[PDB]
């Protein structure tokens, strides 16, 4: 009888909830009640990266904090020089229907995937002055929603088949497959030491995976709808999700609970993209209402507004030196906000 | 000019990349994108053979106009997480079998996929091209099994010319967006060979009515 195993699994996640309430002695908003607020944050559009012709679906900064790759649905993958607004590369994709892109931390590779279920790694720093597909990673049976490089040889991808996967790039096979989700995994975020990663799915749950062990360490259930965005705190001991029920929630990894909820009554639409700044004091969330809200992460209070996109802000990321924020949108424009 | 010799040559590369983005965007803006959205393989692949893995793009040409049918039946994911990718498609070619009305019901599953995608948020203005195929098999079934199985509120007889006009009107009464989108209905089969002629006529009615909407005339 599996209903006995159903009765034990309902008894066992009460021990999850009771041992999580046994640590909730003081909230984050009680501790940072006696701290000074951030005030008002005035961010200006420094650059507008024009040149895409469709909805920009992802971007990713390089670790040098100057180059960024972006993916749009015109079948292009442009690498931008963000300081002097030059296109470094324009990579034509075999599938126009891309939903993610990643820049390698070495700078030599760019991956992208989408509705074709394939994460194609493109080699930028070749000979020949050309950008060629160095690998295509097949094995996912759903649309590939996110990809992040661990190094030049490993890449974690997530997909709509309720499955994240770790890949070896040269032997293009799944080294590890992360199952346990019951909905389409919409995002992932590696830890700063890249030994763990969190993944948010459409079953309103985030899961913390061990990369080398291959197991689900912790499961975080606090949302009511599809988690579209996830991002690690710069400490690596917390993360912030962003979902379709218009709230961002800050979960920690050690106390195993959520700390804050970043919600307003003026926002009704969901979050597409979540990223902390450097030092984790700011939480920049992009929304469906053409708008990116800067949240003071230690309090709940809203700091300034990154307004200036004519369509839904689909992607955003802060540079690794924390100097700028680039937001892409469904109008074909990437704006850089210092 | 305050740029170095290498930074001036990096601007010239970026301007030459810009020139190839417009030449490849003008080549794609002259193309017609179509989203094929049949319900449970209801003759969805039998009209791909009549023109000329995640999604299957089918390129074909008619009267120097390049079409692209993006069949999305091989996804099996939550549709709401990727159906906004096809927002901006020219039309939605919908395939409904006319012989699944007797087969919870197979025809009511077609009307539910029709109702969700025609009254969708992202397809509030993209016209549906309904394809009521397998009409030859509908002849051999409506003479024995009436339309009272799928449609109990139907008083007309088992003549095909009034039964097919009822299934067309039952599907075309599902758009609440009648002031902004239109539904082009065809009754086809495998033996019908004028179906790419209908798609060329139905999407040139879409692109004309979209150009007249964009030029301020409508």
């Amino acid at each position, epitope marked *: 009888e599996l209903d006995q195993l159903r009765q034990e699994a309902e008894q066992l996640k009460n021990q999850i909830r009771d041992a999580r309430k046994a640590c909730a002695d003081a909230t984050l908003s009680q501790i940072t009640n006696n701290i000074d607020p951030v005030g008002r944050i005035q961010m200006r559009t420094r650059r507008t990266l024009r040149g895409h012709l469709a909805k920009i679906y992802a971007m990713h900064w390089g670790t040098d904090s*100057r*180059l960024l790759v972006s993916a749009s649905q015109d079948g292009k993958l442009i690498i931008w*020089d963000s300081y*002097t607004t*030059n296109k*470094v*590369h324009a990579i034509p994709l075999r599938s126009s229907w891309v939903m993610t892109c990643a820049y390698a931390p070495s*700078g030599n590779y760019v991956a992208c995937g989408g509705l074709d279920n394939i994460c194609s790694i493109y080699n930028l*720093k070749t*000979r*020949e*002055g*050309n950008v060629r597909v160095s690998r295509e990673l097949a094995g996912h049976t759903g649309y590939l929603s996110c990809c992040r490089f661990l190094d030049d040889n490993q890449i974690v991808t997530s997909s709509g088949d309720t499955t994240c996967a770790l890949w070896d790039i040269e032997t293009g096979q799944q080294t590890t497959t992360f199952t346990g989700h019951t909905g389409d995994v919409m995002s992932l975020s590696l830890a700063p030491d890249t030994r763990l990663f969190v993944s948010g799915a459409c079953d309103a749950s985030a899961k913390l995976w061990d990369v080398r062990e291959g197991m689900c360490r912790q499961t975080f259930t606090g949302h009511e709808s599809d988690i579209n965005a996830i991002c690690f705190f710069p400490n690596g001991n917390a993360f912030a999700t962003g979902s379709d029920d218009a709230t961002c929630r800050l979960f920690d990894l050690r106390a195993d609970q959520e700390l804050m909820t970043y919600s307003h009554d003026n926002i009704i639409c969901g979050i597409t993209s979540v990223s902390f700044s450097k030092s984790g004091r700011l939480l920049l969330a992009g929304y469906d209402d053409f708008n990116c809200n800067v949240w003071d992460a230690l309090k709940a209070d809203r700091a300034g507004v990154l307004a200036g996109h004519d369509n839904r802000v689909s992607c955003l990321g802060v540079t690794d030196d924390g100097m700028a924020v680039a937001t892409g949108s469904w109008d074909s424009f990437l704006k850089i906000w210092n | 000019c*305050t740029l*170095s*010799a*290498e*930074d*001036k*040559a*990096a601007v*010239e*590369r970026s301007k*030459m990349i810009d020139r190839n983005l417009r030449e490849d965007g003008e080549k794609a803006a002259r193309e017609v994108k179509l989203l094929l959205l049949g319900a449970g393989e209801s003759g969805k692949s039998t009209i791909v053979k009549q023109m000329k893995t995640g999604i299957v793009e089918t390129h074909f040409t008619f009267k120097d106009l390049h079409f692209k049918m993006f069949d999305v039946g091989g996804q099996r994911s939550e549709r709401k997480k990727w159906i906004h990718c096809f927002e901006g498609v020219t039309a939605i070619i919908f395939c409904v079998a006319l012989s699944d009305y007797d087969l919870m019901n197979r025809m009511h599953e077609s009307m539910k996929l029709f109702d969700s995608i025609c009254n969708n948020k992202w397809f509030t203005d993209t016209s549906i091209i309904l394809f009521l195929n397998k009409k030859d098999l509908f002849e051999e079934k409506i003479k024995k099994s009436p339309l009272t199985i799928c449609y109990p509120e139907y008083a007309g007889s088992n003549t095909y010319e009034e039964a097919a006009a009822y299934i067309q009107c039952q599907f075309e009464d599902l758009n609440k967006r009648k002031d902004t989108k239109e539904i082009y209905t065809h009754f086809t089969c495998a033996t019908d060979t004028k179906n790419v002629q209908f798609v060329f006529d139905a999407v040139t009615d879409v692109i004309i009515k979209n150009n007249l909407k964009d030029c301020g005339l409508f």
Partner: single-chain antibody, 232 residues
């Protein structure tokens, strides 16, 4: 990737001769291509440059007006139409590819060259040493001093280091100042101070023997130094 040049040969002075540089194994149309000549006892000297897409075309002041550089991208071929040849045009003309974006490595591949024989405001790069006796395994510091600050406002120091081994074409070592080129060993290292620059070979092997040219890329014309020969 290889560049092979054609043309050359004995030419009467005042005549005309067309050099052709057949490119193969790389995306030729996305590269700017240079012509760099070397007189049979002197050092390198930049002649002409045509960009990708033939947008900008530059020449040296010695060859302006009577030389014409042109590319043909479908055949992957680079031309240098030379008319009214003088006795100062007796040289080995190298055909150099160079791509320009952020973080690129210009001047990275050099052609083999065709010896053309005829019958009988510029930044000054100065390498004061002309010949250095070296034993292998030692540490060498080739020095090069400019006549202008090669450091730009964007932070880049446009100083290039080449190594022409005896009997071969030049090979890029250090593309911007302190930027090791791809495929060269880690024992090379560049360093500079805006106007004075050094190239440090840590543990020199037998392959490091040759002439070391410093080139500026701050403005056109690109000028080389009369390089420092290294001898065992």
């Amino acid at each position: 990737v290889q560049l092979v040049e054609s043309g050359g040969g004995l030419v009467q002075p005042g005549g005309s001769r067309k050099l052709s540089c057949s490119a193969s194994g790389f995306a030729f149309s996305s590269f700017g291509m240079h012509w760099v000549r070397q007189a049979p006892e002197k050092g390198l000297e930049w002649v002409a440059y045509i960009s990708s897409g033939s947008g900008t075309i530059y020449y040296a002041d010695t060859v302006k007006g009577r030389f014409t550089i042109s590319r043909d991208d479908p055949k992957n071929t680079l031309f240098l139409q030379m008319t009214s040849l003088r006795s100062e045009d007796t040289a080995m003309y190298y055909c150099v590819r160079s791509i320009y974006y952020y973080g690129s490595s210009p001047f990275d591949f050099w052609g083999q060259g065709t010896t053309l024989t005829v019958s009988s405001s510029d930044i000054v790069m100065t390498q004061a040493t002309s010949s250095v006796p070296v034993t292998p395994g030692e540490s060498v510091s080739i020095s090069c001093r400019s006549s202008k600050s090669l450091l730009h406002s964007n932070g880049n120091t446009y100083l290039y280091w080449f190594l022409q081994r005896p009997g071969q074409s030049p090979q890029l070592l250090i593309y911007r100042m302190s930027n090791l080129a791809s495929g060269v060993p880690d024992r090379f290292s560049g360093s500079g101070s805006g106007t004075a620059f050094t190239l440090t070979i840590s543990r020199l092997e037998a392959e490091d023997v040759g002439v070391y040219y410093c080139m500026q890329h701050l403005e056109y014309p690109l000028t080389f130094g009369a390089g420092t020969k290294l001898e065992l």
